[PDB]
């Protein structure tokens, strides 16, 4: 009816949005019930990066974490993956969109990071960009630990070690189940005949720099065995040195 | 009558962090109390503003909400867990809470009995 043509009009507005105030019908989108229909009327695939930054701003600011999760999984993350794949870098507006999406961390981890990791096709540039984005944002310890348990339990991809390492650089107090999952993942790399890159070695090195004081002696010797079986000419002496000069408790 | 009130209260607080059942501070502890989804109220005796304490007392006495009084707000902030910890577990951020409101309980058989006995002794 009359609502449909107004939302076609604001669809035409959002396809060319650069700056300024948006219509007030756009800002009351989360307060409505049938949001998916009017959102598909607004055609988010044809949005401008500034318009999607404002949409992420609005949707993150208005509570209801499940709906923010659905918006991040359905609209924001495909746009990010399409922009990295074609432009080989992330836009300024979309970068601040992902930061304002990390304003809501619970919908972010379960909507942006974990679906990207379980998609399997996550490239290295996407890993670097998203890891820098989680590096900039201060993250709650519970959400970071749950995401680290998630990424530890998953099947390995080369992009996963960057996320794991940049989560270990946060230097938070770690739950001991999380460290058990990390050690079990690395000891799951014990019998792999695949050549592992320097990224995996750097993730292990980071785990030994920051959490060597909270490692049991049995898993310490297991990590020494791990270094023995899967060596590197450069990093493995340093990981061995850091494991040798560690005090527990 | 086995363990004291000042361990049962922190057990109730721990179950509340587990079940996400604390309205802490000044205004979440007030607005969630006024929505009557809340159960218990805790006030720090060490205060700078007296009619704030009077307002909390009036909020408690409006709908028979029980009031608990603790001495210092920094001790209550340590009790709640608003302190950032290191790898060893050493607190480095000291933020004190004044009004702590318990909305949801954990299903306890020891601390709940102790606080119920203290409440039946009080009133």
């Amino acid at each position: 009816p009359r609502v449909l043509e107004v939302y076609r009009g604001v669809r035409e507005v959002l396809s060319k949005y650069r700056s300024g105030k948006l219509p007030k019908a756009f800002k009351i989108i989360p307060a409505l019930s049938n949001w998916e229909q009017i959102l598909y009327v607004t055609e988010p695939e044809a949005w401008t990066a500034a318009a999607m930054y404002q949409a992420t701003r609005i949707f993150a600011s208005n509570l209801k974490e499940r709906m923010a999760q659905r918006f991040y999984n359905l609209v924001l993350l495909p746009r990010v993956r399409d922009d990295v794949a074609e432009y080989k870098r992330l836009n300024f507006h979309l970068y601040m969109a992902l930061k304002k999406a990390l304003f809501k961390p619970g919908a972010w981890f379960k909507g942006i990071l974990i679906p990207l990791c379980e998609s399997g096709t996550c490239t290295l540039r996407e890993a670097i960009i998203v890891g820098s984005i989680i590096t900039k944002c201060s993250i709650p310890v519970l959400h970071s630990s749950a995401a680290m348990l998630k990424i530890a339990e998953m099947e390995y991809s080369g992009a996963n070690s960057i996320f794991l390492r940049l989560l270990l650089d946060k230097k938070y107090a770690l739950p001991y189940r999380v460290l058990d999952a990390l050690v079990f993942h690395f000891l799951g790399f014990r019998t792999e005949k695949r050549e592992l890159p320097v990224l995996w070695h750097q993730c292990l090195l980071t785990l030994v720099q920051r959490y060597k004081a909270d490692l049991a002696t049995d898993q310490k010797e297991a990590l020494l065995e791990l270094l023995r079986l899967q060596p590197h000419p450069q990093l493995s002496p340093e990981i061995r040195r850091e494991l040798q000069s560690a005090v527990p408790r | 009558g086995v363990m004291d009130v000042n361990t049962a209260l922190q057990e109730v607080l721990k179950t509340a962090l587990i079940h996400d059942g604390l309205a802490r501070g000044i205004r979440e502890a007030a607005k969630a109390l006024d929505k009557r989804q809340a159960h218990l109220c805790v006030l720090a005796s060490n205060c700078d503003e007296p009619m704030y304490v009077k307002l909390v007392e009036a909020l408690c006495a409006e709908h028979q909400i029980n009031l608990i009084k603790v001495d210092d707000n920094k001790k209550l902030g340590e009790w709640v867990g608003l302190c950032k910890i290191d790898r060893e577990g050493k607190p480095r951020k000291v933020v004190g809470c004044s009004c702590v409101v318990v909305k949801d309980y954990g299903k306890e058989s020891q601390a709940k009995d102790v606080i119920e006995e203290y409440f039946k002794c009080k009133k």
Partner: peptide, 18 residues
């Protein structure tokens, strides 16, 4: 859930995984 566990030294928070 793994088999090699924390052994000793304190439990600060229980963590919500569910």
């Amino acid at each position: 859930s793994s088999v090699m566990r924390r052994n000793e030294q304190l439990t600060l928070h229980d963590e919500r995984f569910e």
